Design a protein around this ligand. Structure first.
Ligand SMILES: [Zn+2]
Length: 257
């Protein structure tokens, strides 16, 4: 794909091919914690990952995706602002070149080192590609990463990155438990938005956890050794693969706490 994160094809350029980039419900956004309102109508969030079946990890030239078997309700998200059942299809991260940037969402304008997106699709639409055409097709669980203590549950991801350095490379990645990437609290903010990469479809209910997870400098450093390019091409470190905050326009962010 043409688009990217370079100064010639980055986020400021996307609108030329994807005019929805200047749409009414684009993501990410800044979460103003003093404007977000507690919503007692929200039901408890249910993260049901015990039967998760990971398959593979893929460098797709933009991030790396850990892919799951979504042929059955094996790892689902329910509750919270959601109606129905949303199946985990993949997770990926966005991260920076420096520890002071990398997240897509911001919290009172604070940028985190990275942001994990666990992507789920609404089973009432039958498959992911149909779901992304619907305003309630996806539910993305967003989790901030800050640099501190190592995250043990991330280390298996870190250790395979050497095997998917360049675009198009994949590796088997079975028996990975995504529960190890969750913080202790499931307190979140929620709002209607979009994919944060082209095609930027406005199909996401965003659920952004308040509590970050901590990862070590060594761990995030390993993310930064990935490459955007394909093998045998000049090296372009995979860093700063984040879209900045977009206008909130006619939306309200709700808090679960
Ligand atoms: Zn993402």
């Amino acid at each position: 794909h043409h688009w990217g994160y370079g100064k010639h094809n980055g986020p400021e350029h996307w609108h030329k091919d994807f005019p929805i980039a200047k749409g009414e419900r684009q993501s990410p956004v800044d979460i103003d914690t003093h404007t977000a309102k507690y919503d007692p109508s929200l039901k408890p969030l249910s993260v049901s990952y015990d039967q998760a079946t990971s398959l593979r990890i893929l460098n797709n030239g933009c991030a790396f995706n850990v892919e799951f078997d979504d042929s059955q309700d094996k790892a689902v998200l329910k509750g919270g602002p959601l109606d129905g059942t949303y199946r985990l299809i993949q997770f990926h991260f966005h991260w920076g070149s420096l520890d002071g940037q990398g997240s897509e969402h911001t919290v009172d304008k604070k940028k985190y080192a990275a942001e994990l997106h666990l992507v789920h699709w609404n089973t009432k639409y039958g498959d992911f590609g149909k779901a992304v055409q619907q305003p309630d097709g996806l539910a993305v669980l967003g989790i901030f990463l800050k640099v501190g203590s190592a995250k043990p549950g991330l280390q298996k991801v870190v250790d395979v990155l050497d095997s998917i350095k360049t675009k198009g490379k994949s590796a088997d990645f079975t028996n990975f438990d995504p529960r190890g990437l969750l913080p202790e609290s499931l307190d979140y903010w929620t709002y209607p938005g979009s994919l944060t990469t082209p095609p930027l479809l406005e199909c996401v209910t965003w659920i952004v956890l308040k509590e970050p997870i901590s990862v070590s400098s060594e761990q995030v450093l390993k993310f930064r050794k990935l490459n955007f390019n394909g093998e045998g091409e000049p090296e372009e470190l995979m860093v700063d693969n984040w879209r900045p905050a977009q206008p909130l326009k006619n939306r309200q962010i709700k808090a679960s706490f």
